[PDB]
Amino acid sequence: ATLRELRGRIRSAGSIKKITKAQELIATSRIAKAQARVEAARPYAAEITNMLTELAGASALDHPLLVERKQPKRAGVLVVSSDRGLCGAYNANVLRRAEELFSLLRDEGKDPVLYVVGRKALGYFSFRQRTVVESWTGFSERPTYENAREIADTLVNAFMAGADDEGDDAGADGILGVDELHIVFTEFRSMLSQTAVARRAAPMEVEYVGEPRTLYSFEPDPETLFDALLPRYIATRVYAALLEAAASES
Amino acid sequence: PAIVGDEHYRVAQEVIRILQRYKDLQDIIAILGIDELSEEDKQLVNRARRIERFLSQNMMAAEQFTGQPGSTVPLKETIEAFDKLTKGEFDHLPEQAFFLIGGLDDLAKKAESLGAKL
Amino acid sequence: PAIVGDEHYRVAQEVIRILQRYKDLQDIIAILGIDELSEEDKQLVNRARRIERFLSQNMMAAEQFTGQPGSTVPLKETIEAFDKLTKGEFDHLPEQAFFLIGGLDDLAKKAESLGAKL
Amino acid sequence: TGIKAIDAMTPIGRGQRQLIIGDRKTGKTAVCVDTILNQREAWLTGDPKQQVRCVYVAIGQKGTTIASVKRALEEGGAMEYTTIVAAPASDAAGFKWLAP
Amino acid sequence: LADADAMHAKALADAKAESEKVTEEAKQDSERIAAQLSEQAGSEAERIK
Amino acid sequence: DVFYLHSRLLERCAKLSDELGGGSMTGLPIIETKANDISAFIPTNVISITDGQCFLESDLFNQGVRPAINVGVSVSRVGGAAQIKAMKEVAGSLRLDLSQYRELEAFAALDAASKAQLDRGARLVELLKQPQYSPLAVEEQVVAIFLGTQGHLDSVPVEDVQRFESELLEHVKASHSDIFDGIRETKKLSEEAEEKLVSVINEFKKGFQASDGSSVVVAEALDPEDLEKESVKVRKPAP
Amino acid sequence: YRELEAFASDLDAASKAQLDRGARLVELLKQPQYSPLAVEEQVVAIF
Amino acid sequence: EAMLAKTAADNRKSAEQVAAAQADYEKEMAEARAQASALRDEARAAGRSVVDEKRAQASG
Numbered sequence: 001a002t003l004r005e006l007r008g009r010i011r012s013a014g015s016i017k018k019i020t021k022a023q024e025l026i027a028t029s030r031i032a033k034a035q036a037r038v039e040a041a042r043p044y045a046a047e048i049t050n051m052l053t054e055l056a057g058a059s060a061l062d063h064p065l066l067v068e069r070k071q072p073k074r075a076g077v078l079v080v081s082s083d084r085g086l087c088g089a090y091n092a093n094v095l096r097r098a099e100e101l102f103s104l105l106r107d108e109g110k111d112p113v114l115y116v117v118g119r120k121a122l123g124y125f126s127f128r129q130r131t132v133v134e135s136w137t138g139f140s141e142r143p144t145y146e147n148a149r150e151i152a153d154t155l156v157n158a159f160m161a162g163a164d165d166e167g168d169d170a171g172a173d174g175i176l177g178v179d180e181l182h183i184v185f186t187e188f189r190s191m192l193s194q195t196a197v198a199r200r201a202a203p204m205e206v207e208y209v210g211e212p213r214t215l216y217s218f219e220p221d222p223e224t225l226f227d228a229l230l231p232r233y234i235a236t237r238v239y240a241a242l243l244e245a246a247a248s249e250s
Numbered sequence: 251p252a253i254v255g256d257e258h259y260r261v262a263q264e265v266i267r268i269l270q271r272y273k274d275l276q277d278i279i280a281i282l283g284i285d286e287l288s289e290e291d292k293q294l295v296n297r298a299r300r301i302e303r304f305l306s307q308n309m310m311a312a313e314q315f316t317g318q319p320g321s322t323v324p325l326k327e328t329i330e331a332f333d334k335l336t337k338g339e340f341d342h343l344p345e346q347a348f349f350l351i352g353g354l355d356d357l358a359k360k361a362e363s364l365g366a367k368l
Numbered sequence: 369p370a371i372v373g374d375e376h377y378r379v380a381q382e383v384i385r386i387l388q389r390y391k392d393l394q395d396i397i398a399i400l401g402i403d404e405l406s407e408e409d410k411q412l413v414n415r416a417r418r419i420e421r422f423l424s425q426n427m428m429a430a431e432q433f434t435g436q437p438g439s440t441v442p443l444k445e446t447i448e449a450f451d452k453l454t455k456g457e458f459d460h461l462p463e464q465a466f467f468l469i470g471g472l473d474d475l476a477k478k479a480e481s482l483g484a485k486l
Numbered sequence: 487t488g489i490k491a492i493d494a495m496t497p498i499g500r501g502q503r504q505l506i507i508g509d510r511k512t513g514k515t516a517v518c519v520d521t522i523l524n525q526r527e528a529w530l531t532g533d534p535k536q537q538v539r540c541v542y543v544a545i546g547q548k549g550t551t552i553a554s555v556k557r558a559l560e561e562g563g564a565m566e567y568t569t570i571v572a573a574p575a576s577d578a579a580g581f582k583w584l585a586p
Numbered sequence: 587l588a589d590a591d592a593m594h595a596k597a598l599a600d601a602k603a604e605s606e607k608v609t610e611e612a613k614q615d616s617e618r619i620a621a622q623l624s625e626q627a628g629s630e631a632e633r634i635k
Numbered sequence: 636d637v638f639y640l641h642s643r644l645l646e647r648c649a650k651l652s653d654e655l656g657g658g659s660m661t662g663l664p665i666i667e668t669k670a671n672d673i674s675a676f677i678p679t680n681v682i683s684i685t686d687g688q689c690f691l692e693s694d695l696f697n698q699g700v701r702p703a704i705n706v707g708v709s710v711s712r713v714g715g716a717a718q719i720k721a722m723k724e725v726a727g728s729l730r731l732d733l734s735q736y737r738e739l740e741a742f743a744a745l746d747a748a749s750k751a752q753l754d755r756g757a758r759l760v761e762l763l764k765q766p767q768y769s770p771l772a773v774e775e776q777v778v779a780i781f782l783g784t785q786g787h788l789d790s791v792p793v794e795d796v797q798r799f800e801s802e803l804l805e806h807v808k809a810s811h812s813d814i815f816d817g818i819r820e821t822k823k824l825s826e827e828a829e830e831k832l833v834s835v836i837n838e839f840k841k842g843f844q845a846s847d848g849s850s851v852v853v854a855e856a857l858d859p860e861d862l863e864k865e866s867v868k869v870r871k872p873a874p
Numbered sequence: 875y876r877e878l879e880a881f882a883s884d885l886d887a888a889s890k891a892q893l894d895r896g897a898r899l900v901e902l903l904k905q906p907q908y909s910p911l912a913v914e915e916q917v918v919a920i921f
Numbered sequence: 922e923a924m925l926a927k928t929a930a931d932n933r934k935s936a937e938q939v940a941a942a943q944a945d946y947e948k949e950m951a952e953a954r955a956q957a958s959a960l961r962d963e964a965r966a967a968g969r970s971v972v973d974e975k976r977a978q979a980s981g
């Protein structure tokens with residue numbers, strides 16, 4: 001029976017080898033596609049950055065999403081994971097970075113509020129007994145701008161609700177919120193390099209540069225455009241993070 | 251086809267093909283998982299599991315080993331039921347409903363006892 | 369348990385169970401590593417690696433081969449240390465900290481020497 | 487036998503031959519000795535239709551292990567209705583072949 | 587609010603009664619277990635004799 | 636003639652007719668396999684001779700499954716005829732169910748039916764664990780398998796199945812001790828006996844304490860600088 | 875076809891064509907029992 | 922205005938009081954169950970000690 005079972009093992013190993021080689025090649029093609037979609041989104045975000053900069057420089061720096069919350073107590077963390085599992089350390093590194101952020105947040109009295117993209121992180125946190133506020137699934141292989149739109153909308157609503165939330169109470173709104181929006185995802189540096197990075201989506205921070213030749217006209221007013229545009233910038237950066245995560249996963 | 255007829259032969263060949271493909275896929279399912287199969291192959295795996303359970307039967311002579319009385323399934327009903335299985339008509343039923351039963355009436359009753367319905 | 373007591377027997381059986389589960393998982397691990405395992409299986413695999421390293425010891429007769437002198441671990445200390453291991457009390461420490469050492473004092477010393485701490 | 491697994495999944499009747507087959511140190515002797523010890527209630531009933539008389543045939547078994555089995559039978563009071571046919575490893579091949 | 591206070595008081599009283607009943611039942615079970623185990627110990631001692 | 640050697644020996648264990656006194660001899664031959672090779676010569680011969688086998692495995696033994704019965708390949712060729720009526724009733728398809736459970740567990744390394752089967756099989760596997768030198772009377776085994784296969788272990792955690800079994804058996808032996816007497820005398824579990832047993836199980840479940848604490852009734856940090864900040868860009872000098 | 879189906883759908887165009895051609899040819903080589911074909915008929919089928 | 926504030930506060934108080942009542946009932950029942958299990962287990966341990974010592978002294 002030894003030879004029989006050993007030949008069966010040989011056949012099983014052959015089947016596994018063939019499947020894995022096919023998956024490797026398909027993953028190569030998917031890396032190509034994901035990278036191409038990463039360049040495809042560069043111009044829109046690159047120039048909407050310029051539009052946002054012009055609005056900010058031609059308007060007061062007082063947007064609710066832009067102003068830091070006194071006594072921060074709850075930081076929102078979004079973990080971008082994968083749907084499939086055949087990636088080796090992708091989810092593991094993403095979740096190790098997520099914990100390396102959670103401990104920091106608890107250090108400063110911030111209780112993280114958990115949001116999830118993908119399925120593997122759901123299982124990891126279910127094992128770790130950490131509740132998930134909201135989860136999106138089924139598009140990590142190829143994320144479309146729509147999904148980033150809903151994700152950004154939900155996270156921004158959670159952020160805004162915290163403005164009227166007092167202590168452990170929700171205040172006038174009645175919906176408890178968060179003080180920060182943090183993103184954990186894998187930055188696709190290159191083929192060999194795929195490192196998880198924690199990123200604070202909110203509250204927005206401000207940099208400055210001294211320099212103006214001409215003044216941009218606005219319609220109706222700069223503040224209205226800033227209000228209508230800042231959530232769009234949040235969504236754009238979330239979409240870029242999702243694209244990077246897809247490329248890194250591939 | 252000459253002796254048993256075209257339909258009997260076709261159903262038998264389809265069942266054999268499905269079971270052969272399932273046996274081919276079993277190693278991959280064991281190591282990687284069923285979620286890495288093509289949707290067609292996942293459907294075929296579910297059908298094959300249902301079929302292999304349905305090929306089991308409660309025999310009269312096996313009563314003393316199970317207590318359950320045996321059953322007899324006519325050839326025509328067997329051919330029709332396996333033709334339906336190969337086409338995925340019973341995919342919505344749990345696989346346990348196909349374990350040690352007779353004809354399609356037994357299948358319906360057992361699936362009823364498990365919550366599902368035919 | 370009738371001879372070595374309940375605690376020693378329990379610790380030994382738990383260690384044996386963990387190592388057996390690791391041996392079983394070898395088939396998946398040889399191909400796909402630890403990544404595709406469940407969180408329970410990942411935790412148990414790390415624990416089993418630490419246990420199998422901690423069963424090694426610097427023998428007295430081995431000093432001729434490596435210069436390092438041997439160590440003697442009392443039976444009670446062995447039971448206590450392996451009970452702590454099987455409970456996952458040393459998960460943080462690196463694997464090499466458990467390699468060719470004696471009791472828990474040696475474990476702490478080598479963990480410190482490796483940048484960790486017990 | 488007093489063992490849930492055997493009595494529920496692979497029941498043993500009177501006049502049956504059940505094979506305890508397994509690798510070293512898998513509990514075969516444990517199962518057989520527990521089965522022998524489980525007959526003490528039937529022996530104490532005194533009804534020969536209930537009593538089961540036990541025979542243990544140790545073939546090629548180290549004598550100290552035979553002594554340990556005899557002790558395990560003594561402590562449970564099973565030697566009162568048990569006979570041991572011993573062909574230890576030191577016995578010539580004739581006794582080993584003839585003991586069963 | 588009056589109803590909530592009354593309901594809390596009623597729940598506390600019912601909890602007290604149920605806890606007393608459970609404690610009494612567990613007690614009786616404890617004596618029963620001790621008695622049967624002592625009988626078994628006596629039987630084992632007689633067997634040893 | 637080694638096969639003959641064993642066959643003529645093992646065929647003398649028989650159940651005589653009432654003409655010859657009705658006596659019987661039950662055989663428990665033991666076989667030592669090497670490297671779990673039941674395909675060797677003597678193992679094959681003796682397996683083909685006897686009326687079933689209880690195959691013991693070292694993998695199952697090390698996993699904590701003791702006795703290490705391999706339910707898939709262990710079988711008794713007499714079957715229900717070698718059991719009292721109550722044991723037949725409670726443990727009708729237990730071996731078959733456990734074989735199917737092991738199959739499913741291997742394949743599903745999911746729909747509600749699959750999870751229910753897996754949980755039931757885990758509970759049943761826990762139920763059949765038994766320490767050495769701790770025999771159970773036929774009535775106690777009947778009650779235990781009743782716990783298992785009647786769905787009364789589904790509410791208890793898998794880890795507590797053994798302790799729950801032991802404590803319920805102790806409770807029934809302490810009080811409600813007439814169920815054991817009924818099973819002993821009649822060899823069958825009466826409808827009223829089953830009613831009383833179910834009620835006793837429910838009450839004990841209410842009393843039972845889970846090991847975790849429930850009721851069975853019904854890392855280093857990112858350097859704050861490393862955390863990249865999402866900052867809007869303003870084309871002004873700082874104030 | 876064997877190599878590229880052991881592989882296998884989002885393939886290079888030529889590879890998709892090869893998969894389709896190979897499946898067709900595999901179906902072509904099948905033959906019922908007791909049905910030998912004349913050389914000309916085999917030529918036409920292979921054509 | 923004080924009446925409206927009191928209405929809101931008392932609505933909160935009634936909700937949290939119902940929650941605390943049910944939680945406290947469950948907690949006290951859990952404490953009773955734990956005490957019962959402790960009594961049973963200590964009785965079991967005492968019986969085991971008694972039987973062990975009795976058999977040991979009988980053997981001696």
Ligand SMILES: Nc1ncnc2c1ncn2[C@@H]1O[C@H](COP(=O)(O)OP(=O)(O)OP(=O)(O)O)[C@@H](O)[C@H]1O
Nearest residue numbers: 509510511512513514515516517701702765766767
């Ligand atoms: N149900 C059980 N629970 C715990 N330990 C057990 C159980 N059954 C047997 N053992 C232990 O397993 C070990 C093997 O038992 P045993 O000597 O009966 O096995 P064996 O297969 O006959 O061995 P060998 O190859 O030495 O003849 C012994 O330590 C025995 O105490």
Ligand SMILES: [Mg+2]
Nearest residue numbers: 511514515516
């Ligand atoms: Mg032995």
